[PDB]
Structures are given as C-alpha cells and as structure tokens.
Amino acid sequence: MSLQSAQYLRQAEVLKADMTDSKLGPAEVWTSRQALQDLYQKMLVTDLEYALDKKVEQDLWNHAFKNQITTLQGQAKNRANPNRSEVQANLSLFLEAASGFYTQLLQELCTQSSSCSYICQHCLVHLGDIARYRNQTSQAESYYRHAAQLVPSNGQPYNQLAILASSKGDHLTTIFYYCRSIAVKFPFPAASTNLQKALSKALESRDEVKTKWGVSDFIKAFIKFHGHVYLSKSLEKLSPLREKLEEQFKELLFQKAFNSQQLVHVTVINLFQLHHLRDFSNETEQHTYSQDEQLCWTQLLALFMSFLGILCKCPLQNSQEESYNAYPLPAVKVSMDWLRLRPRVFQEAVVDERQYIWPWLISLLNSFHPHEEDLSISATPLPEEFELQGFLALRPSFRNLDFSKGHKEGQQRRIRQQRLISIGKWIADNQPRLIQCENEVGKLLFITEIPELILEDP
C-alpha cells in the first residue's frame, strides 16, 4: 500500500544522491546502482501508480543507466584512452545487461490500464535506446515502433525513431518522425527544437542547379520548402520551388521512382505543416493571418492539392497489372482523409483553382467497379492507418477502427478501395458541385460535370 512506498521511495533517494557521492568509492557506487535498480523495480511492480507519480521510471533510467552509458560512451570514445578496449568492453557488458534488465522488467510488468500501457511503452523505448547504443538498428527500430503502437498519443517514441533515422542519413524519414513527435496530444518537447535545427541546416544549401531531379534531389528540395514555411524564412523562394516540386513530383512518381512509403511521408509532412499553420480551429472560428502567413498557406495548400491531383492520375496512366496503382493509393487516401475533415478548405482559392483534379479521382473510383461500399468500417486498420495513429490532423478519421486485433493484400487493397469509394460518397454529399454519385441498381457510378483537363499530346 501507499505506505510501503514512502519507505521504498525515501530509501531510493538515499541511493540516488549516493551515485553523486564524492564520499563513496569506485565500487560502492555500483553496489548502489544495483540497489537503486532493484528498489525501483520493486516499486514499479508493487505500486505502479505511486511509482509513476514519483517518476521512478525516469530516475531509474537516468540515474541507473543513462548517466553511466554517457560517461562510458565518453571514456570509451577516444580520449587517448589509457585502455579503451577495456572500457569499450565494459560499456558493451553494461548495455548487454541493461537490455536484460528491461526485457525482464517488461515481462514482469506486462505479464485497459493507461499507466500499464504507459510503463510498458516506457520500457520498449529505452529497450530501443539501448539497441541503438549497441548499434542494433533493426531491433532498435522494432522496439521504438512497438513502443509507439502502445500509446500513439505520446511523442517520445517518434522522436527516438527520427534520431535513429538521422544516424542513417534518411532525411525524409527523419523529418517525418519529428513531425509525428510534435503532432500529438503530448508532444515530445525536444522534437520541436530538433526539427527547427534540422530545417535551418537544410536551408543552408543553395537552390538546386539541376533542372531534372532524382528522388534524392526531390527530397532535399521538398524539405527546404518545409524549412522555408516552418521557419518562415526567405519566402520569396516558395513560388518557383513549388512549381518545380510539382513538375518533378509528376515525372518521378510516373517513373515509379518513389515507394508508397515515401509518398506517405511526403503527404504526412504536408499535412503536418498545413495543420501547424491552421488547425481545426480554422474550421470553426475566423482568424487573422499575416501577409507572410498567407503566402505560406497559399503555397503549401497549393503544393498539396497539386500533389493530390498528380497522385490521382498516376494510377490510370499506362504496368504490373493492378500494381500500376496502389503505390499512390495510400497517399491519395491519406490526403482525402484530411480534406474530409476540413470543409472550409474546399472554399479555398487555391483549391477552386484546381477542381480539375476531381475528374481524375472519379475515373479512379469507377476504376474499382463500385457497388454498395457505403456498407463500411472494416474496423480492421490498413497499414497507413496503423502507422499514423495519434496524428492530430488525422485523428478523427480513426475514431471507428479497432487497432487491437488486426494482425494480406486483397484484404487491404480491396479495403483501401472501399475507403476511397467511401470518401467519394462523402464528397458527393458535401461538395455536390465537385462530385456526384449516381447510385443505380446497387452499382455506384461516380461522375462530374467538371471537364477533364487534357493537356497537349506528347
């Protein structure tokens, strides 16, 4: 009961300051670290509630592991180390042991509660940091993922996944995870300064000299665009960069240069900025925007609608029999899921301007031979849905799916199609001027009076 903890807690503080000790030896420090570790484990297992409040979880990691790991990484990471194989070896044993401690802790604690789901997430995370420390990139990732899946609303798992991504030079992935970490009910404070720091560095490179981009170039230019907006720096760049990004996105996407994953990251990063500039509040109350803020929303919203349109064409354009599509599909779906939540965006100048994209979506919906799909909520989450849990801008789109049981294609491609068929119905019922769905004989046919934009031949 709450009474044994007080004793366990006072006991703990007695061991904590011990680890600072100037008065305890080279190896009375460790006899103390082990004790702390044990004491903390008993509390977390004995009174998780009382434990979390006192923040045992965090003191357990910092004082019992992190401090040592950093000190060790230091002494072992060349300083003209007297013996630095010896230190590297201990760091190695220490991390090996740390991993063992948390694996054990996890199994004990997790073998409805939010506090339970929490600490289990907390364990997976550090178990992920240790893997990272032990250069076990795959397992570190797997751990951080699993951690995320437990409490989508927390942003630390995402921030850790970006650090891992950055260490491998995967920029798009990195920016994506910082965004995921920042956009949740409980954002990881460090994620904001991390993104800012990353975007500012990005804006340190000059405009691309090439007129024909490779996927790697696109990514770089794409991130600077977000850099410019996010930091609201040198906006004069936006307009041309937008047009060039649009041109290149089209060519690359059509050459199959992207994988559906990057398409999702690009879309989510675009959704991140959009929401970051004007949240759901803008769909309620009317805010005033600076001239520069308008320039950003105008350029950003535009790039997004252009991309969405380009994504809806990619499918019906000229491969692998059914696979000519479906790389773009998750990105189209995500894009549409957001529009469905922002009615007032359909009134936007840059959006009216592009109502030529709807014919492409429409011919894409009838590409599915729609029937009664407005059935309706498979409830079994698709990949891109599981992946984006907790993302503010998209949260409402999830308020029906059960992410618990869910565990492969036909069951996902044919579901995603329904999701799209569903959105077309919603558009048809909420923006009648854009799309209409003639529901006849249980067969659904999507149509639009908007003519198809057919550019010149080549």
Oligomerization: monomer
Strand content: under 5%
How many helices does DSSP assign?
A: 20
What is the radius of gyration? 26 Å
Number of domains: 2
Count of β-strands = 2
Following the backbone from N to C, one meets helices and strands in this order, namely: HHHHHHHHHHHHHHHHHHHHEE
Structural class: mainly alpha
Categorize the overall geometry. Answer: elongated
Q: How does the major sheet shape up?
A: 2 strands, antiparallel
Q: How do the strands of the widest beta sheet line up side by side?
A: 1-2
Structural account:
The protein is mostly helical and 458 residues long. It has two domains: 1-206, Serine Threonine Protein Phosphatase 5, Tetratricopeptide repeat (Alpha Horseshoe), CATH 1.25.40; 207-448, no CATH class. The protein is built from 20 helices and two strands. The radius of gyration is 26 Å and the shape is elongated. It is classed as signaling protein.
Topology readout:
Elements: H1 2-16, H2 30-46, H3 48-54, H4 56-76, H5 84-109, H6 114-133, H7 137-150, H8 156-167, H9 171-182, H10 189-202, H11 215-231, H12 238-254, H13 260-277, H14 291-316, H15 329-339, H16 349-352, H17 358-365, H18 383-387, H19 395-398, H20 410-430, E1 436-440, E2 443-447
Antiparallel strand pairs: 1-2
Helix pairs in contact: 1-2, 2-3, 2-4, 4-5, 5-6, 6-7, 6-8, 7-8, 8-9, 9-10, 9-13, 10-11, 11-12, 11-13, 12-14, 13-14, 13-15, 14-15, 14-17, 15-20
